[PDB]
Amino acid sequence: TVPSILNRMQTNQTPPTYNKTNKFTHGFQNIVDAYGIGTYREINPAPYT
Amino acid sequence: TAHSFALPVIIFTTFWGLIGIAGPWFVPKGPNRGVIITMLVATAVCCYLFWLIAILAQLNPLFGPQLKNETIWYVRFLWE
Amino acid sequence: LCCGPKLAACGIVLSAWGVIMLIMLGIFFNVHSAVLIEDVPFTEKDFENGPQNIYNLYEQVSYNCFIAAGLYLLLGGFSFCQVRLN
Structure with missing residues (x-):
């Protein structure tokens, strides 16, 4: 009966990078990932590549 | 055989x-819109520049x- | 006769490519298209009286290409039969 809780917090660790890839763009996203994944929220070269 | 250099550039x-420029607006309101617009714009750039x-x-x-005399003799007849 | 399905698939793909390309090549030679002059078997004495003397050889090579395309079509048929068996 008594519920659980989900908590936010001030964080010092660096966020990962995520892209919501789709069927068509997966190969290109991998192509740009091959040389290092972009830092949090920097411009992705995948849509232009 | 004059290909006037006004019509090709206009076309x-x-x-x-x-x-x-116009296709981006015709792409529908959806999730893949941004990537599609980028494809359209950059395809325009690449191909038009090429x-x-x-x-x-x-x-x-x-x-x-510079032409071998044989192909000179042939194209002389063939082309205008 | 019988053969492996991969061999038959390769045969049918090769037959399709050959048929399309060689039909096109025969068409383009029968057209007397200029870009393929260097491949015509004419001789240095065929340049005297006009283009007809070399038009004839263009036609001959076009017929050769059509014959090759027919051979590839027969190969494609046989490979399709082989695929059907497999």
Whole structure:
């Protein structure tokens, strides 16, 4: 009966990078990932590549 | 056999400009919209630039080709 | 006769490519298209009186290409039969 809780917090660790890839763009996203994944929220070269 | 350099530029410029400028608006409101617009715009850039370089490289030539006398004799009949 | 399905698939793909390309090549030679002059078997004495003397050889090579395309079509048929068996 008594519920659980989900908590936010001030964080010092660096966020990962995520892209919501789709069927068509997966190969290109991998192509740009091959040389290092972009830092949090920097411009992705995948849509232009 | 004059290909006046006004019609080709008009045709391909309006063609690629429409692809790169008007097509983006016609892409529907959806999740893949941004990627699709980027494809349209950058395809316009790449292909239009390729064609423009190719045609300007022939505009105002400095020299004419060199031909074996056999192909001279043939093309003399074949082409205008 | 019988053969492996991969061999038959390769045969049918090769037959399709050959048929399309060689039909096109025969068409383009029968057209007397200029870009393929160097491949015509003419001789240095065939350039005297006019283009007809070399038009004839263009036609001959076009017929050769059509014959090759027919051979590839027959190969494609046989490979399709082989695929059907497999």
